Amino acid sequence: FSATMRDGLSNLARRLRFAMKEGSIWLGEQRMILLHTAALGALRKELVDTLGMERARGLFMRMGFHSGVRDAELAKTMRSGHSDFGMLEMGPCLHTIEGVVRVTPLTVDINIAAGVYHGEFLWEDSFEGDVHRQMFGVAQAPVCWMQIGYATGYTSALMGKTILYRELECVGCGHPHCRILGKPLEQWEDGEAELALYQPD
Amino acid sequence: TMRDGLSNLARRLRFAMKEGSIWLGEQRMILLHTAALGALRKELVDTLGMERARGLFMRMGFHSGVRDAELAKTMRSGHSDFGMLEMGPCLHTIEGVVRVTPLTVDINIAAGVYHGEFLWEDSFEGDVHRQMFGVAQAPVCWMQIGYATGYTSALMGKTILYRELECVGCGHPHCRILGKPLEQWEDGEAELALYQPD
Ligand SMILES: [Zn+2]
Ligand SMILES: [Zn+2]
């Protein structure tokens, strides 16, 4: 049901090592845990309840940003014999293997050497959208915060420039699926202020 | 010393790529980078202080533990009370959180009997805490302790609290924990209070 993503998914699960003789999981050179979405949901609930939705959104986008940046490093380890899109597409694949979301590239214009990027993707079965509705009910703006942070971090680390993403539709809002658009910071009218969300204090 | 638990619980873990999801029993899971979780921990500790951050993580672990206990209960058939208990250590291990070795475990669910001591090796939490900070002056495997507390309390049907008696986060070569009912802990109801959202 996927292409060319298949190759990516196969070539990636081999970088995924489950070692219950040591109680660890490694993906590439990054240690991972399996975490219940319901536990991340409970954390999110307390964060929004005591910090507010905006600051909580920031914490999650940054957490996602860190994940994406690490996965881009893994992506760059197997660049040999890989087009710019083929390297880009690893993000979508890693996002799927980690059970975060089913990603389908809709159309992608990417040139790393030239600094050109324009990407739109479909997101099916976002864990974050579902978790949010269960904790909060329907939302009045897209809620896949960690997931957007990840696309932003992964793509930016890959390009060596800031690529910001925005959800144009989201299941958290009661759509059938999520859909996103990513492009250079410069090209977003209020980009500099979105950028403020990725900084800690 | 169940290897039998690992192989049998690990079969409950599946990757449904076409739906971009991972299932452990009936619970959806994600693979998350410890580095990212650690970045979150540092922000929470920096902005909300350690005691408040500690509470958030214990309660997150607690929720994980309660839900793995619900999975354990489904596989109740043909298992002793000890066998049931051991699925907790096993799931924690399978989840890549920590490698758990039961040391002495005395359990009888009907009679409300529980006293459990466990060895924790390669704790991700203690590990990440001491890289994002330094050696700490008190045990720091917050989420891991929450999980044990939640798993065992759900299995026993009564409040079972755990404490770390050693922790890699404090420069010990390993973590070690003890779990027993609330009444057996000196300041137990102040420990039970960490599990109540603020
Ligand atoms: Zn969404
Ligand atoms: Zn510890």
Helix (H) or strand (E) holding B31: strand B27-33
Nearest CA in chain B to A146: B36
Report the distance separating Cα A163 and Cα A118, nearest Å: 9
Contacts of A127 in chain B (CB under 8 A): 21, 28, 30
CA B139 / ligand 2 centre spacing (Å): 6
CA A65 / ligand 2 centre spacing (Å): 27
- Is B99 close to A46, i.e. CB distance below 8 A? no
Question: Is A14 touching B (CB cutoff 8 A)?
Answer: no
Q: Which residues of B54-85 are buried (b: 16+ CB within 10 A; e: fewer)?
A: bbbbbbbbbbbbbbbbebbeebeeebebebbb
For residue B153, what are the domain limits? 1-198
Residue A117 corresponds to which tokens in the numbers above? 């990027």
Which residues pair with residue B162 across a beta bridge?
A: B179
Which residues pair with residue A179 across a beta bridge?
A: A122, A169
Give the minimum alpha-carbon distance from A184 to chain B in angstroms, rounded to a whole number.
24
Q: Which method resolved this structure?
A: X-ray
Q: Resolution, rounded to a tenth of an Å?
A: 2.1
Contacts of B63 in chain A (CB under 8 A): 36, 38-39, 42
Report the distance separating Cα A92 and Cα B53, nearest Å: 32
Residue B84 corresponds to which tokens in the numbers above? 């049931």
Within chain B, where are the H helices? 4-10, 34-48, 50-74, 81-94, 124-132, 142-156
Asked if residue B32 lies in contact with residue B60, where contact means CB atoms within 8 angstroms, the answer is no
Report the distance separating Cα B51 and Cα A161, nearest Å: 38
C-alpha to C-alpha distances, A171 to A46, A166, B1, B146, nearest whole angstrom: 21, 14, 45, 31
Give the minimum alpha-carbon distance from A33 to chain B in angstroms, rounded to a whole number.
5
Report the distance separating Cα B2 and Cα B91, nearest Å: 12
C-alpha to C-alpha distances, A63 to A94, A105, B37, B62, B87, nearest whole angstrom: 16, 23, 7, 21, 30
C-alpha to C-alpha distances, A39 to A16, A66, B30, B43, B178, nearest whole angstrom: 23, 20, 11, 19, 23
Size of interface A-B (CB pairs under 8 A): 169
Q: Which of A96, A99, A94, A12 is nearest to B23 (CA)?
A: A99
Q: Residues 6 or more apart from B154 whose CB is under 8 A from it?
A: B65, B66, B69, B70
CA B185 / ligand 1 centre spacing (Å): 44
CB-count burial class (<10 Å; 0-12, 13-18, 19+) for A21:
exposed
- Is A67 close to B36, i.e. CB distance below 8 A? yes
Q: β-pairing, A178-184 with A116-124?
A: antiparallel
Report the distance separating Cα B66 and Cα A118, nearest Å: 43
Tell me the residue ranges of DSSP E strands in chain A: 16-19, 24-27, 30-36, 102-111, 116-124, 163-169, 178-184
Q: Which of A30, A6, A1 is nearest to A16 (CA)?
A: A30
Instruction: Tell me how crowded residue B49 is: count the other CB atoms within 10 A of its CB.
Output: 10
Residue A35 corresponds to which tokens in the numbers above? 């975490």
Cβ < 5 A residues, ion ligand 1: A 126, 129, 144, 170, 178
Residue A67 is given by DSSP the state H
Task: Establish whether A144 is an annotated binding residue.
Answer: yes
Give the minimum alpha-carbon distance from A168 to chain B in angstroms, rounded to a whole number.
20
Domain count along chain B = 1
Residue B63 corresponds to which tokens in the numbers above? 């929720």
C-alpha to C-alpha distances, B5 to B2, B66, B85, B87, nearest whole angstrom: 5, 18, 10, 6
Asked if residue B120 lies in contact with residue B89, where contact means CB atoms within 8 angstroms, the answer is no
Task: Establish whether A173 is an annotated binding residue.
Answer: no
